UniProtKB/Swiss-Prot annotation, chain D:
Lineage per the UniProt record: Eukaryota, Metazoa, Chordata, Craniata, Vertebrata
Function noted in UniProt: Accessory subunit of the mitochondrial membrane respiratory chain NADH dehydrogenase (Complex I), that is believed not to be involved in catalysis. Complex I functions in the transfer of electrons from NADH to the respiratory chain. The immediate electron acceptor for the enzyme is believed to be ubiquinone. Involved in the interferon/all-trans-retinoic acid (IFN/RA) induced cell death. This apoptotic activity is inhibited by interaction with viral IRF1. Prevents the transactivation of STAT3 target genes.
Cellular component GO terms held in the UniProt record: cytoplasm; mitochondrial inner membrane; mitochondrion; nucleoplasm; respiratory chain complex I
Keywords, sorted A to Z: Acetylation, Apoptosis, Electron transport, Membrane, Mitochondrion, Mitochondrion inner membrane, Nucleus, Respiratory chain, Transmembrane, Transmembrane helix, Transport
Alphabetized GO MF terms: NADH dehydrogenase (ubiquinone) activity
A biological process term (GO) from this entry: apoptotic process
Assembly, per entry: Complex I is composed of 45 different subunits. Interacts with CARD15, but not with CARD4. Interacts with STAT3, but not with STAT1, STAT2 and STAT5A. Interacts with OLFM4.
Residues of the full protein shown: 49 to 144 of 144
This protein's encoding gene: NDUFA13
Topology of the protein relative to the lipid bilayer: Single-pass membrane protein
Family: Belongs to the complex I NDUFA13 subunit family.
Domain of life (superkingdom): Eukaryota
Protein name, per record: NADH dehydrogenase [ubiquinone] 1 alpha subcomplex subunit 13
UniProtKB/Swiss-Prot annotation, chain F:
Broad class of the protein's primary localization: mitochondrion
GO biological process assignments: mitochondrial electron transport, NADH to ubiquinone; mitochondrial respiratory chain complex I assembly
GO molecular function, one term: NADH dehydrogenase (ubiquinone) activity
Keywords: Electron transport, Formylation, Membrane, Mitochondrion, Mitochondrion inner membrane, NAD, Respiratory chain, Translocase, Transmembrane, Transmembrane helix, Transport, Ubiquinone
Cross-referenced Pfam families: NADH_dehy_S2_C, Proton_antipo_M
Gene Ontology cellular-component annotations: mitochondrial inner membrane; respiratory chain complex I
Tagged with keyword tRNA processing: no
Keyword Chaperone tagged: no
Lineage start: Eukaryota, Metazoa, Chordata, Craniata, Vertebrata
The protein's name in its UniProt record: NADH-ubiquinone oxidoreductase chain 2
Complex formation: Core subunit of respiratory chain NADH dehydrogenase (Complex I) which is composed of 45 different subunits. Interacts with TMEM242.
Membrane protein topology class: Multi-pass membrane protein
From Swiss-Prot, chain H:
Function: Core subunit of the mitochondrial membrane respiratory chain NADH dehydrogenase (Complex I) which catalyzes electron transfer from NADH through the respiratory chain, using ubiquinone as an electron acceptor. Part of the enzyme membrane arm which is embedded in the lipid bilayer and involved in proton translocation.
Species: Bos taurus
Gene name linked to the record: MT-ND4L
Keywords: Electron transport, Formylation, Membrane, Mitochondrion, Mitochondrion inner membrane, NAD, Respiratory chain, Translocase, Transmembrane, Transmembrane helix, Transport, Ubiquinone
Pfam families named among the record's database cross-references: Oxidored_q2
Protein's cellular compartments: Mitochondrion inner membrane
Lineage: Eukaryota, Metazoa, Chordata, Craniata, Vertebrata
Gene Ontology terms for molecular function: NADH dehydrogenase (ubiquinone) activity
Protein name: NADH-ubiquinone oxidoreductase chain 4L
From Swiss-Prot, chain I:
Motif (Cx9C motif 1): 35-45
Domain CHCH: 32-57
Name assigned to this protein: NADH dehydrogenase [ubiquinone] 1 alpha subcomplex subunit 8
Annotated family: Belongs to the complex I NDUFA8 subunit family.
Whole sequence portion shown: 2 to 58 of 172
Protein location: Mitochondrion inner membrane; Mitochondrion intermembrane space; Mitochondrion
Function per UniProt: Accessory subunit of the mitochondrial membrane respiratory chain NADH dehydrogenase (Complex I), that is believed not to be involved in catalysis. Complex I functions in the transfer of electrons from NADH to the respiratory chain. The immediate electron acceptor for the enzyme is believed to be ubiquinone.
Amino acid sequence: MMLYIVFILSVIFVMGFVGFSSKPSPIYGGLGLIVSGGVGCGIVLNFGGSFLGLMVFLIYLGGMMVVFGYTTAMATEQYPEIWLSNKAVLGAFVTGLLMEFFMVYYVLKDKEVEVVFEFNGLGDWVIYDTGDSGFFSEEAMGIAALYSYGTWLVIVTGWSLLIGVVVIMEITRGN
Amino acid sequence: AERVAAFLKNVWAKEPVLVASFAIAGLAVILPTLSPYTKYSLMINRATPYNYPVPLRDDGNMPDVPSHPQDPQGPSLEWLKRL
Amino acid sequence: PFFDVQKRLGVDLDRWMTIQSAEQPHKIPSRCHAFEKEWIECAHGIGSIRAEKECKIEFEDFRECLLRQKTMKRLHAIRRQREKLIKEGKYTPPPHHS
Amino acid sequence: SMMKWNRERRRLQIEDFEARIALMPLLQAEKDRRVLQMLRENLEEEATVMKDVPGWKVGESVFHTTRWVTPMMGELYGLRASEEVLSATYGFIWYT
Amino acid sequence: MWFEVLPGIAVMGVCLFIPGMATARIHRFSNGGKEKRVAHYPYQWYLMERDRRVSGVNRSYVSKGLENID
Amino acid sequence: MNPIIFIIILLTIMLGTIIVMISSHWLLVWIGFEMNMLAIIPIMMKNHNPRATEASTKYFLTQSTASMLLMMAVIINLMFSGQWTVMKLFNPMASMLMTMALAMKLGMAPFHFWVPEVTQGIPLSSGLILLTWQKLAPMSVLYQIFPSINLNLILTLSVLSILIGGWGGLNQTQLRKIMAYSSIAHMGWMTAVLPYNPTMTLLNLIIYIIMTSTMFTMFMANSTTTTLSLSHTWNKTPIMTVLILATLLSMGGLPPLSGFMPKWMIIQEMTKNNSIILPTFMAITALLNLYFYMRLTYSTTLTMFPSTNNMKMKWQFPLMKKMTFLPTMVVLSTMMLPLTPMLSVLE
Amino acid sequence: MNLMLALLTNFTLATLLVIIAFWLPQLNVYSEKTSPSARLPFSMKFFLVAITFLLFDLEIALLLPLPWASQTANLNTMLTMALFLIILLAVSLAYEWTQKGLEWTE
Amino acid sequence: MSMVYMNIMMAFTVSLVGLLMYRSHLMSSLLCLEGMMLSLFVMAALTILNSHFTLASMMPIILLVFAACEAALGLSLLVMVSNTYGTDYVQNLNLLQC
Amino acid sequence: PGIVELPSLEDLKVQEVKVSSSVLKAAAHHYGAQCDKPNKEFMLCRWEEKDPRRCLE
Amino acid sequence: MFMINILMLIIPILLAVAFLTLVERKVLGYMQLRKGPNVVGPYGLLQPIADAIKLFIKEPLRPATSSASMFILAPIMALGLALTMWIPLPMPYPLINMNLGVLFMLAMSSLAVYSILWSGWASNSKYALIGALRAVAQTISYEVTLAIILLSVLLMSGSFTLSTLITTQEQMWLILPAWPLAMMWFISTLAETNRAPFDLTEGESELVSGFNVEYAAGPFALFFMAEYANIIMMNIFTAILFLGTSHNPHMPELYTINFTIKSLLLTMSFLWIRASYPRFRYDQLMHLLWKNFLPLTLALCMWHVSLPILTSGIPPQT
Ligand SMILES: CCCCCCCCCCCCCCCCCC(=O)OC[C@H](COP(=O)(O)OCCN)OC(=O)CCCCCCCCCCCCCCCCC
Ligand SMILES: CCCCCCCCCCCCO[C@@H]1O[C@H](CO)[C@@H](O[C@H]2O[C@H](CO)[C@@H](O)[C@H](O)[C@H]2O)[C@H](O)[C@H]1O
């Protein structure tokens, strides 16, 4: 069962998404996204993306989601309605888990399902690469190349972040 | 001038943290272009062999390509041993 | 590009990352490097209308390398057949394979 | 002090990288034989298992090209114990 | 006196010393009296997997030398 | 806003669009849209009122949703082709997603609801940017991926846009809402001809921008945002009523004015491809737009609505708004039909 | 496997300590007591410190690959773009500083 | 395609449906927007990592950075809405109806 | 498509170097100097042929 | 075997935290011309045990929480993350040898701010929530310098591997080439862990600081243990980062003894500082970060990117 770690994680990934997509109180919506993000990083790690995975934790969870929860406390929620105590929220949550359960049922049984795209249920391990013996991390080499190959990317990305600071100060001044 | 020196005096008295910050940043941007050892950083990075050195098919007229690793021809790392 | 400023000025702003068979750090090749190279060279210069017909063999092999849809179909058939015979006791795994 | 020590560490790294380069031909030769043996073994079991499947050609390629294609993990370990497959797939990612 | 603070510091010191000492000793216990192998890159893991095959007992820390040559 | 910051923000809006237009890589196209959206929000918020905040929020939600769909299409395209080149997409699902994403960005029907509301909620100068410059980047992308676009989808979006734009404008008294529905209707012409001749998409876009720019500039010159406030112009600046009349007739596509040219050239291209029913339907439906352009000309230029006593005080002061390029734009908006063959410079 | 076991063990113990911290007091059986969204109002300044942290934190994401970037052959390009990023990070601070984005006085 | 893609594509679809079906809180809809980006980040990373497209390894970072910056802009607008009305309810944003 | 050609198990049989990586690491520098010629022929074959079946000898 | 290793890390951590509470009271006592605990056990050695038993059999507080799930999650998160921060530390060998161990520690610490936020949300008090938000703003602000300072030091180390910091300092402590970064690092760790003079959660300027105010909270002991585990861990990280201990592979215990002493001394300096200074105002500690540390940290980051290149001292990658 450990040989299907990626698939099991992706099932939890979808369940968390059905969590905040049914849109309970924003406080618990942030919790569903935080769990999904942590599971999402786990999936990326198991494909050899150690740096990319840790960026999710550092920047997406430790950065963006902290600010979401910060803003939710100040501007949105201070106490929440009990999760799944609302008709639409619970009905949406039940509907999502039924769709996920059936997708998982048919993919495991028939080893293949077809919705828009054709999906194979042999196991995500079968597509992996069989040749690895370099003395470095390919992922790290590709990211490090941002400063040599990606001059233009750095300029526009750097400009956008600076403009973000300016714009948000403009927006929030109020006059 | 002397107007310039007075201004440097006022900031050094009121904003020593910023004076140090701009001084350190200025060295960061200027010294690399002036340093003679900057060239060695590029050479050392190019002397590090991450990939296998694929051999060349010997057509018969590559005098400067060594046939054996211990032959005299080819790039030397003598400069690195001394550096 | 709508305005091909890069080609006019001869400056590479983003072409370096458009395909996986372009130069990579430390010459690390992508898994489908050979297939992409062959498809690109087949279709080069002739335009997309012609390429959609005359480089179909190269593109089909390139797509198989990318998503391995036919390789997985063949593996699934063997595995399905195998477990059928193990259920019926008409096949035994060898010492290796265990 | 940091400069001298990092220069020496760069020299030590080159020594370690050159030891690998000296060994790569032997490691490459072994890997090729190991890969080819596993594929040959899979083929033998395919002939047995798919003997009576109608229309099946044993060992057929899914590519039009006759060029050698590096097999994926499923093609090599497709018919093997879960422990060896698990080690081959996630062993490196899961090692500490 | 100030040296009556030391007994509590000694207890803290022993507690902080244990995890480092335990890990070192357990590593050598589990890897045949040697340091646990470090494999940060695929090449190092590739050699470790090769040693596990070469050992003949399925342990990468069992080393075979010239006695295996012939 | 500090005027220097206002200049930097406008230049960033332009930079985002320019990045989309020179990029050969899908990631850089996406970045150009992101940069563009970030820089335009402040100019919408700049007058600080609840209506401007609602419009900014509605615009942000629409554009962010579109940009996520665009990225989804790019990633699907990567999975099925292994490359990032801005060109025809290699998966029909990716094509549909990107086409819908770009339709949402353009405000095409049935993704149109935000255009009337967002335009109404922001100043005239911001609306001018929204309805002219903001069309350039999505059009430049559609111009490059059109060979892979589903023909039925793009023509359906075009027909609906022409119908909704025409009908939506009939019920409007607000000038900014009229220009929003006019933009939606004119959008449908540009996309309708795209599968057949993308050069005529560019021609219609250029002429639409010139005429729309002329209209907004004249509305800004007198600070008019409603039909009835525009009906006072005759008793302040009579020349402006004549210029407004000529431009509105041009936007109506009446010969011999410039606005007829794009309709004329699009009809020609569609008929060359044995498309007779669709151009006839489009031409007839465009009469809806002519109707609510003509209604404006009635209240502005061809009759004289009642004035107010305090209007006499305005007679004593000159127009001091810049009205940049207005004399040139109004001439191009009306007198260019004799130079129609010059459209080949767009080829 | 080991990392998963460590994370599971650490958060398992934390969970047990929490529940027994909540149950163990119930052994005393203490007497019953019988005796006891919207803005906060939130200051804009506290929102703006969080946003500034985020934007600065995103620029730090771009700087994290610097130790690897220094191994490249194109050191001049790498050093130019590294200093470019840090300088724009400084320019963001300077803009915030000179528009009183870092003040706490109302 | 591989099995994992089914779930990542489901997650994007789920968060997209969640984005298009509002309730009351504008905040709850922004979370669905961030959920969409998270699923794109994961699907992009899986495709790039598995194919060994080395130079594309930086693309998921750029995606995350630009999407977080756009999320900061969205949060700022939400705060300005909450200042005007005292809640982030989307039903108060209906002035432009007329 | 065709049948993928594979060598027989007997054709793949060689006397292996059953020493550990530390043994190989210790000998690596001298081994690289002494066995350069056959090693470099093998590596030239692998990069030119791009097929392990073509370099088994 | 690995399960033994985990417990031989977790249990001693909890014991060190317990007896750090005694060391703090006695060190603070003697700097204040008094003794501190010396009655409960010889030299107060049983005082941590008496406090622990007393706290766990104390009645739970009132009022009731606003969110039961968040009320329970916050202490689990705080303590779970605190223990997790220890698993990659090389002492000299780590429990988990990560290639990106430094980044792992950054990532895990950035998640510690959630327990503050969740406990404020679950406090059912408007004023308690506002206090939590001020604490979060302080924490994230000083995370900026910790990340940038850490990145600057790694440009001399060459990787994100924690055990590579040991090799980097084989000849010399990194505090010599980087004492300006060490100064700001050390203060940032104080502010990050809400330690005096940055302990505004325990200060006099909070809306909830009033003694007669009440809000849902607890358990006190679990939050306290998590905090003090982070104090020790940060000081262990500080020693590794700037005061690298020499490692002899044949005598690893010598590393551990010397490494433990340095960590203890750094931890004692936290107690030293708490005894010596008044408390910052909230706006003043924000000013310290945004207008002092951050400008200087950015400048020193520029310098440490440039310095290895211009001196030809770029460290190895592996
Ligand atoms: C080149 C080939 C292509 C050919 C296409 C046709 C080209 C013509 C379109 C050019 C663009 C429109 C500009 C035309 C110039 C208009 C000049 C004008 O009408 O005078 C303005 C007049 C002045 O009013 P006032 O400010 O009081 O000054 C008093 C003067 N001592 O203002 C007034 O007195 C108010 C007048 C009352 C309203 C009368 C409404 C009818 C106006 C008829 C002219 C409009 C023509 C546009 C339609 C096209 C005609 C074919
Ligand atoms: C196996 C281990 C089990 C865990 C055992 C935990 C034992 C905890 C013993 C704590 C000993 C007392 O330690 C002391 O406590 C008080 C809290 O009342 C702290 O007091 C501090 O926090 C409180 C608020 O929380 C403030 O009101 C006070 O002004 C401030 O000084 C002291 O900073 C600390 O030095």
